[PDB]
Symmetry: D2
Subunit: 115 residues, 4 copies
């Protein structure tokens, strides 16, 4: 489990469930090559995106479809999406948790990186 | 300003208007002594709390009545209030902005501290 | 497990380990009566603070000793502590996770409340 | 301002000074067209990006070079940048402040949107 995404809802005080998440790797022509995707579970989590062997050093983008989430809840959002862009494994393979906290007009994102 | 408080509403993307703010300073006997109070303006700011002279070294507490703000909008929020507790002017006078960003079940707070 | 506290470090990108956490209940004379305490684990979590039967409706305060944490890391902090004050169980017993994300001059706190 | 960007440093409790910001607008063929750029001032603000006339309806992207900011301070941060993507002026002209609060392994961003 090298990469996990966790999404929380600051309005309802709950996991953000059924949020679409797309993961991309930066290709050698600086285009984003899509890589993995899924929807958050009932606990707001998305596991199983990639494997140790596949998740090589590179620049990755995680795109979280916040706008659809807020629309599904009948709440007007500001952002198209929340994007998180980071270089992976620069000092060795790590386990990455990308956590995002969502409000309609704000979001925060944090990485929890462990050995 | 020696002390300013700024409050934003993360649901609406707006200043949080008419939010009550109470400031306290810790006394020599460790109680909380009322220091100043006010409410946020149309810009979500509260100015004029104190003066450089009055704002001496000490531990201050800023209590933002976030509950009453959300209740007035129909929302039953998680938090009773947002409180920010800090030592001020330990290395000489500084200007403090206390910013809070409010959601029903979350808040964040940040300090910007500048040397005049 | 009616009440859990989770603390993350935004500087290091890690759980906040060995952070002291005190929990209080508001007494009938409006004083804070201390109630439970502990230190966060290696995963930044604190479990086992209270039981279903004990965690009755009331106003609770969770005080997280951020200042000691930052001092232990040799980083100058702004806040004395992060406090979270909330009324519990107003519509029935819930499971409460209090999550805090720490930076030296900022913190955020969110509640994840589930049935 | 039709568009202002404000950046704060959560480690130091200060404005984030000299942070590069690039703004893009999505074209009719779905590419990202350069729109404006600048760097934050001593107050951590960037003004003068656009004008009411130029800032028409569309999807905009604000990319804040947070990596270079942290690297200059000796820190290897998590994020390459902070990017904020949003539809602007969908219901008529509005004033947008995009605020970002930066930590090495975290950032938050908020929009304050006002009607002149």
């Amino acid at each position: 489990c090298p990469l996990m995404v966790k999404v929380l809802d600051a309005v309802r005080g709950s996991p953000a469930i059924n949020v679409a998440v797309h993961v991309f790797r930066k290709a050698a022509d600086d285009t984003w090559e899509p890589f993995a995707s899924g929807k958050t579970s009932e606990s707001g989590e998305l596991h199983g995106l990639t494997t140790e062997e596949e998740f090589v050093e590179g620049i990755y983008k995680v795109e979280i479809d916040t706008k659809s989430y807020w629309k599904a809840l009948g709440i007007s959002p500001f952002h198209e999406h929340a994007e998180v862009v980071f270089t992976a494994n620069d000092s060795g393979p790590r386990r990455y948790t990308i956590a995002a906290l969502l409000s309609p007009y704000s979001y925060s994102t944090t990485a929890v990186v462990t050995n």
